[PDB]
Amino acid sequence: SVEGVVRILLEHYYKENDPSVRLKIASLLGLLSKTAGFSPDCIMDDAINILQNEKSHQVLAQLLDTLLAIGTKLPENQAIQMRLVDVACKHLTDTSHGVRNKCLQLLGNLGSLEKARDVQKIIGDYFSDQDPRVRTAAIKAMLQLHERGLKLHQTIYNQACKLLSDDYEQVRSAAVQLIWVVSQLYPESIVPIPSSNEEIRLVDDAFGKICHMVSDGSWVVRVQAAKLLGSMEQVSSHFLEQTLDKKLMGACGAFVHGLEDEMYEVRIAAVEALCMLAQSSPSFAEKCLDFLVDMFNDEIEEVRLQSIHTMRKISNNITLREDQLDTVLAVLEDSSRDIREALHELLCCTNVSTKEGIHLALVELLKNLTKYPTDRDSIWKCLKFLGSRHPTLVLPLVPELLSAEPDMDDPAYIAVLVLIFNAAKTCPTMPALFSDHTFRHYAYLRDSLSHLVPALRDPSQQFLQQSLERVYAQELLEFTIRDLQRLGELQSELAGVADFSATYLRCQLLLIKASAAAKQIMEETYKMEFMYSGVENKQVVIIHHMRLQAKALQLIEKFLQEVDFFQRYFIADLPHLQDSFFLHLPLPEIHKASATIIEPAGESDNPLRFTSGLVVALDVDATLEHVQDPQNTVKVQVLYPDGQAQMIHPKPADFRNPGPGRHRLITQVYLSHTAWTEACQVEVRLLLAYNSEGTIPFSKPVKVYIMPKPAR
């Protein structure tokens, strides 16, 4: 009953004279226009008849809004689009600004993508209109037209550049965006500077113009330009290096003016631009390294963190010096643990050039260990990379670092041990300097912490291949399972597929031997699905087949609906699941995610005090490694000894991001209950939440001791 009531309301609009009620009716039409499967194209002519005799302003605005909404609904009927363009150019000259906004948006979203009026020039005439909002909407329509796929003309740059000296805010940002895109269109063209006789590539003109634009008195446009400079690669390098000559103080020296501007936001945007343009060009990277290491002494922490990430992203494209290494390692003394973790991950890939540099790096990392103990698990891993990259610099440190025999519980001793073992793995001559007690220590850290110490002086890959082809019964399954476990603890680089195939064969064994074993099958399939990274459609087929087996076997109604769902979602795998309910599992290329609860340790006999009925705060600080988007699939679980369970979902902004594959989770958990009599223990652990609805425990739980003291 759409067209009927629409025609009734149109006959009302014809007889009703109050413009506000007319606008009410028009809004009703606009809201009803979105009926999916209805033909309001029969009403487009009527809409044009309404706009052909209007006297108000907003009416035409929202009416052309409806026309644009319906034109975006059928963008293939080019005749309707040409009619809309016609009536728009008819109405384009209207005096009001809102109607002009609507017509320019209609042109932008419904322009002719074929190279028959030149809508480009018609719109471009409006960069000289009176109300600057009209010019803003005009540039926005230009952007919309371009982004649909139309390649634009050269002149737009030469017309937009005039707006650079305008005294309004959004217009300048839009102008910078237009220059950016049009120079990404015609970069190499030759434009002569009218202030001289020189002629430079158009990309260089664009770059210099954006640089000078950064010197504007508005900060929004400064953010815009600083960001948009980020992806400008094809510009000539000498101009770029000129943009950091602090001595020349606007087409040059922009970065210096930015990295010390008032609002830290433009500083951060400039850091991003520097990072990108340094990843593209290594010479400019080494040139800007000075200001980049200078950015460490910025008073606020977010620029610190971001500059740290960026500088680490250009490791091979820079070379650190003595003073640079000193200034970067002096930062470890900072209080914010996030900066510390970021700095740790930074140090894993730095290009150190001097042996005393490695000495001082180890010295400062050990100092950081002493000051902040909890950072332990970080430092070691970073050292795992330190020795595995620069063996020629650590070579003379072996006699001095090996120095009485310290005990096996000094984190510094173990750290330097891992470092020198990573060194010796890359040059087998250091094992001869390793003392007998050093060899005992190496054996201890080897059978204990093989995930840090390497295997000193690939057959394991072909060994895994033969072990997987041997299984293609229970005794061979057990033997292969323990072989996979032993090799996974032997080589951590391959431990991923090791535990993958281990739990797969575990499921196979528990299924072939077979009430709770079905639940165990289900949980192992759950873990292989969710807790792991890098699964392909083949593995999904296999694990869903195992799930079907598990449900069919736990049966001894819903089974038929679920196998129907399986068939519907797996229409492609059916020619690949021949003779199914053994099914081959390919081992793809893999890392097992995990969780390391660190703060607090709970081993402290000093408990946490609380009063006779009140909250108490518990700060959880735990790192995660190679987790797939932890913002969703991670929760913290609290168990009181009674039997209840609190499942605290953590907020988004509490999962910090220090580096690739590593994430940090610092959060607050609120411990209390009904009145407590005596000091007791509580359980806090992690959980992986999945929706196929379920929870998987994958961290070693931490028991915290809470002690009462009734209030005063």
Next chain:
Amino acid sequence: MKLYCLSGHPTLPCNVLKFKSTTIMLDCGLDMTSTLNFLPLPLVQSPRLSNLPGWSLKDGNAFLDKELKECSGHVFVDSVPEFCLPETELIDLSTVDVILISNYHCMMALPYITEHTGFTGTVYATEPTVQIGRLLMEELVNFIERVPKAQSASLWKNKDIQRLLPSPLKDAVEVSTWRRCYTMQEVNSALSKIQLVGYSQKIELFGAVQVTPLSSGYALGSSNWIIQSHYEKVSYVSGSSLLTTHPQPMDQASLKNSDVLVLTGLTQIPTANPDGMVGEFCSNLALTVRNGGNVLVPCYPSGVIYDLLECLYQYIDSAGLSSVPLYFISPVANSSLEFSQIFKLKHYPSIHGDFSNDFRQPCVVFTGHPSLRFGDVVHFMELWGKSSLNTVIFTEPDFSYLEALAPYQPLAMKCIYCPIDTRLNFIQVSKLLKEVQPLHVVCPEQYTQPPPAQSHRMDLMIDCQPPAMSYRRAEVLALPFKR
């Protein structure tokens, strides 16, 4: 000239004044009573409310037995408190060019407007209002997101199912545009668009319009706007006070010669004497502190509290109460007191940490959000809800108190209700109108007809000639002036 009134709420105003060229948005606000239909967000697992009897439908066509819960005769949605919002359908929020502001109690809805839907203008506000507004939005974002409960509830939201659930939920309005709160970065970026403005600091607009604020005496920096032109003058006066409090008293003389007085933000308690009710507050606090019991006084961490505390101080030395501490628990305490001073009470940042070492009973504990649905007040209202000695004393007219207190029933603590509204009452607004002589008046429908609860009175209706044109929620009025 047009007036797209969005927020039908009577004292949390918001309206789009559409003009010749600009389209200004006078004081977009956030209806917040929508949080009363939802359960609370207690800090620790509340044993009484986790095991409520899951209410069931009579037919049971759907599994509503997990969404709605039943407690002592009222059934509630189980979710995060999905706040109310100004309708976002009449006018597209991008055409708006300038958003003014009156005072913090009305700016809680800027993140919803200028960040989620592509707003392009710049908002004006005095300095104290932007400060206290940052502070309020901070406590809100820090209360709702301390133990997130994102598990939603969607089946109830349909119209068909809604028409089958009894009051109070059937009383809900526009249930399809209710949203979870906003996030931290959102408000922090939104407040960056502020451009401070002092009093009588003439501001221009596109060579077309002129705006200027005037001190209004409601609160620090609270302001009555003036939006005039070469031919028209609109005098927005939203929530002013004539009782001479600390703020610089209002300029009731500049609003003359006006053409449209969009009068919004009058009292909600027309039959309540502010001074007498403050006396009642002090009375009950003394009565239940001088016997041993506690007291729990919900109040925003700004505004009326600075009134209340002041009186309480003048009461401490006129009744000899020296031996009872007076707390202030909120995650915005320090900045709050600093901004009250630089323009006995021991403030604290949060109930966890330091506070648990100064707890001496009896005490007095002003706390977080006064809709008894999140913050800290939930924790105490679950701690003292069993001893007939203790006491809660509401001092906020915003949220109707009956339903507010309801989802903690059956409770055995007293619950006084003595609301303190320093706003313009109706005899004062009649005198103010006859003085300022506005050519017209625009007031929400809650005013030109007497209140519902007290139908027999006919004196609390705003009496003015010509008759006061009114607006209903999400309506488009035409101020009948022809150029």
